[PDB]
Amino acid sequence: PKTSAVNFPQSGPRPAGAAVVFGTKVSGAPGNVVSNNAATFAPLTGTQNFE
Amino acid sequence: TAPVRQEGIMTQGDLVTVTSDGIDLNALWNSFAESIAIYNEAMDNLIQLLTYPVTVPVEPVVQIGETTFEEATELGVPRGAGLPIEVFQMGYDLRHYDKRNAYSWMFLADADGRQVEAIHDAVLWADKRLVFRKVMEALFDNRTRRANIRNQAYNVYPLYNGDGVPPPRFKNNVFDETHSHYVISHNSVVDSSDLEDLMELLAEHGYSPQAGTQFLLLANKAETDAIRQFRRGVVNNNGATAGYDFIPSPTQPAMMLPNAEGLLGNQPAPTFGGLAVIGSYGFWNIVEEDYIPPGYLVGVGYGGAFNLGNPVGLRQHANPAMQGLRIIAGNYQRYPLVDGFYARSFGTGVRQRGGAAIMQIKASGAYECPPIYKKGGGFLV
Amino acid sequence: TAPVRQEGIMTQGDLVTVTSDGIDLNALWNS
Amino acid sequence: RGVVNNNGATAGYDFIPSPTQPAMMLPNAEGLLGNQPAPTFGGLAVIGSY
Amino acid sequence: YQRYPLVDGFYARSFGTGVRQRGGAAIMQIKASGAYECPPIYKKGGGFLV
Amino acid sequence: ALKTKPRWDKYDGYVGNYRGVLGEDIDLDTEANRVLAVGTNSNGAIVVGAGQTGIKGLMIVAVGADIHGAMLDGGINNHAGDPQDVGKHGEITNFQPTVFGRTFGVAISATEGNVKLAVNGVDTGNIAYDTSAANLKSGIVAVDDGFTADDFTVTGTAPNFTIVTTRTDVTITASGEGVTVTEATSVAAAGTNYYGHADGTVNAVKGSDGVYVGHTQEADRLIVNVKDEED
């Protein structure tokens, strides 16, 4: 593949005061091996061209 | 630990305390830490070889793009020219998981901190077992998924499975829409032939020993105990004859070299990534792994000219606060109840759809997903 | 499968342009 | 390895002699793929491994 | 044609070929009987591309 | 903007309003963004209509739409095995009754001769002012429009009939003189008791299977209080 679609995760600002509805991230969690090895899928371009 | 699951509000009488004969039961919660560590190392080695952070490459479609000269004349003029171009993309799913724990005020008045820490640890263990199951299920479940982004619905894919864009042509190998890397052996017991047939599924696309591709075979004890018997030119199961020797790794017990010639193959390193390799057969490095179910072979290619990588892309949520395992304050806070949540969100998909293949060893019918890695079956391996 | 040659004056409608969803197809001719 | 012994059972491995065992001739000048077992385990004398 | 409504331009090459040392090479075709055939990919009238 | 759509306004989630998983795919054109009466099948799973248990709650499958007004297909709350929320106690706002397909009352004013109906504007073969219920079906089916008998149902007696349909894209009308057609209509009515049915519809009428799910107050709202179905 010759190029990649640029990802654009923050479309705009996020609502204030929601910070308790999402938790604190426990640091030693054994499943964090998976989410340490993960990234944000939010491509800006080519979204009508998924095949 | 046993498959027994207490749920609900923790109450007095669900308390653990020093017994009347002085046994501090609250000291004993960590007593399985060795088995949990042996399970933590096995899953982490598989995850580090099977998975990688998602990216969105623009997938090239090979195009004709032809043009030609003609013979000139001293009067008159030649014809024009023009070219086509086309591309596509692939995506990944995302899903949300959670758990709750709840205590009465009577429980929290009398409880040892060691009891609630054990419940925290057991939830952190159920979290690993979930994310590992979804990594395996992303490779083993041959069904196509749906997801949505920017109001567009798109398929999320496993390996080649008879859905989506066909594999591109390689040399004279050409592939129609039905082509699939989920296959059967056509026999009740594994052959050396099946390790040849499995290799062909990667090599038909050019992912090959000639290309410099490294190969890993993951199998259960049930299969590796047959594969250890493959001797070059000797018959195996189902009338197959082995084309190569099984070569034991440096760690295995020794063998007498049976002929002056020596064994047809190469002796592997004792590890592939972090996994312990038992030996090779042809170009496959063979790994013994009980997390592959009995009656399944998983062949995976890496490196080479085609630059193969880990088969499964891992997606996190776009909101930074949604990332990792998270502990959340509950709706009940003081009296008579306290509660709390744990939540994770992530998902998966395969972009590199030809770099691996799965064979089920049986006589007939389609491939079956092993129930332990089928999408609807549960939340634990 | 077998090659075809486009020949003629290049007009509008033979243009390659940024897609409705923002793919710069003109970054890709060297592919 | 691969030779049937008693009751129709086929061996997965060779019996490999310990270094205290008498010398033998092998079909290949490298002899073994791997080592011979250590001649003692704990304080006991080892005849070989399987 | 140079501005409006058309613009054009040309590519041109002139060259040619021949053999001097007529004995310094030879071609064999693997076949049972009949004449040597020039392969169509290298027959003079067949086109301008390999 | 253009439409309001039913939503939970109060739903607590600790008082026997419950999580489950779907036993089936939800139809996004026909069942999403509606108040569905639900039970559970012989497994642990939510079904639209009466399962093994009878009606045990209400469900709203909330689904977004694109800027062109079509439903987002790749959702994670609407396929078999997705998790969903079922309410017994709460309030639903922007409330509307739930009905599936189209249904048309046909009645004949003629006392002699023949009458004509249009299906999607194209005219039917002539039918007697005393046609059988079997011959309204046969008449309506018999045009080169591609619907066929498979998606019409007819019931009645010569003066009048109901033409039921499972699809939304077929419209009956009168076209000749001597016949009248009205499509049925449903809208919420204030101070009414609503009733879930074995179909999964929610309506103001208790027939032979209706299980009380709540009462409205002002028509735009429903106070949910499910009198759970029993054996």
What does the DSSP assignment read for D19-42? Answer: TTSPP---SSTT-EESPPPPSEET
Give the H/E segment covering residue C26: none
Dihedral angle, C-alpha B361, B376, F28, F9, nearest 10 °? -170
For tokens 């790794």, the residue is B249
Contacts of C15 (CB under 8 A, 6+ apart): none
Q: Are strands B312-316 and B51-53 parallel, antiparallel or unpaired?
A: parallel
Q: What are the CA-CA distances from residue B63 to residues B169, C8, C11, C31, F219 (Å)?
A: 12, 19, 21, 10, 61
User: Which residues 265-304 in chain B show a CB within 8 A of chain D?
Assistant: 267
Query: Among partner residues F14, F72, F79, which is closest to B153 by beta-carbon distance?
Result: F72
Q: Could you identify the residue written with the tokens 């089916």?
A: F141
* Chain C residues close to B87, C-beta within 8 Å: 23, 25, 28
Q: Is the dihedral of CA F3, F9, F14, F15 positive or negative?
A: negative
Q: Which helix (H) or strand (E) holds A32?
A: helix A32-35
Distance CA F187, CA F176 (A): 30
Coil/strand/helix, residue F50: coil
Helix (H) or strand (E) run with residue F133 in it: helix F133-141
* Residues B226, B237 contacting (CB under 8 angstroms): yes
What lies within 8 Å, CB to CB, of B240 at 6+ separation is: B191, B192, B193, B194
F221/F9 Cα distance (integer angstroms): 9
Q: Which residue of E has its CA nearest to B73?
A: E12
CB B226 within 8 A of CB D10: no
Contact D28 B260 (CB under 8 A): yes
How far apart are the C-alpha atoms of F63 and F77, rounded to whole Å? 8
CA–CA separation, F169 and B169 (whole Å): 44
Q: How far apart are the first and last CA of chain D?
A: 10
SS3 F90: strand
How many angstroms separate the CA atoms of F56 and F228, rounded?
Answer: 5
SS (H, E, C) chain B: CCCCCCCCCECCCCCCCCCCCCCCHHHCHHHHHHHHHHHHHHHHHHHHHHEEECCCECEECCCCCCCCCCCCCCCCCCCCCECCCCEEECCCCCEEEEEEEEEEHHHHHHCCHHHHHHHHHHHHHHHHHHHHHHHHHHHHCCCCEEEEECCEEEEECCCCECCCCCCCCECCECCCCCCECEEECCCCCCCHHHHHHHHHHHHCCCCCCCCCEEEEEEECHHHHHHHCCCCCCCECHHHCECCCCEEECCCCCCEECCCCCCCCCCCCCCEECCEEEEEEECCEEEEECCCCCCCEEEEEEEECCCCECCCEEEEECCCHHHCCCEEEEEEEECCCEEEEEEEEEEEEEECCCCCEEEEECCCCCCCCCCHHHCCCCCCCC
The residues on C that touch A, with CB distances below 8 Å, are 19-24, 27-28, 30-31
Beta strands at B255-256 and B145-149: parallel, antiparallel or unpaired: unpaired
Tokens matching residue B89: 């993309």
In angstroms, the CA B57 to CA B89 distance is 7
Report yes or no: F140 and F154 within 8 Å, Cβ to Cβ.
Answer: yes
Q: What per-residue string of b and e applies to B241-265 under the rule 16 or more CB within 10 Å gives b?
A: ebebbbbbbeebebbbbbeeeebeb
Radius of gyration of chain C (CA): 12
Q: Do B255 and D33 touch (CB under 8 A)?
A: yes
Q: Is the peptide bond before F159 cis (omega within 30 degrees of 0)?
A: no
Backbone angles phi, psi at B47, to 5 degrees: -60, -45
Cβ separation of B70 and E48 shorter than 8 Å?
yes
Tokens describing residue B367? 């491939």
Rounded Cα distance between B240 and F149, Å, is: 57
Q: Do the bridges between strand F46-48 and strand F117-119 make them parallel or antiparallel, or are there none, so unpaired?
A: unpaired
Tokens found for residue B313: 């892309």
DSSP D10: B
- F37 DSSP β-pair partners: F58
What the block records as the tokens of B108 is: 């929290």
- Establish whether chain E is in contact with chain B, requiring a minimum of 3 CB pairs below 8 angstroms: yes
3-state helix, strand, coil in chain E (%, to 5): 10, 5, 85
Q: Report the neighbours of F using a cutoff of 3 or more CB pairs below 8 angstroms.
A: B
Cis peptide before E5 (omega within 30 of 0): yes
Residues of chain B contacting residue F81, judged by C-beta atoms under 8 Å apart: 375-376
Strand partners of residue B65: none
Say whether B151 and F74 touch across the interface (CB within 8 A).
no
Q: How many other C-beta atoms are found inside a 10 Å radius of the C-beta of residue F195?
A: 22
List of chains touching E (3+ CB pairs within 8 A): B
**Which residues fall within 8 angstroms of residue B139, CB to CB, at 6 or more apart?**
B50, B158, B159, B298, B311, B312, B350, B356, B358, B373
Question: For residue B154, what are the CA distances in angstroms to A46, A49, A51, B130, F8?
Answer: 12, 9, 7, 25, 29
Q: Rounded to a whole number, what is the largest CA-CA distance in chain F?
A: 65
Q: How far apart are CA A24 and CA B124, in angstroms?
A: 14
Phi, psi dihedral angles at F223 (to 5 degrees): -85, 110
Determine contact: B70 vs chain E, CB below 8 A: yes
Q: Name which of F5, F3, F63, C17 is nearest B153 in CA terms.
A: F63
Cβ contact D28–B229 (<8 Å): no
Using DSSP's 3-state secondary structure scheme, residue F202 falls into: strand
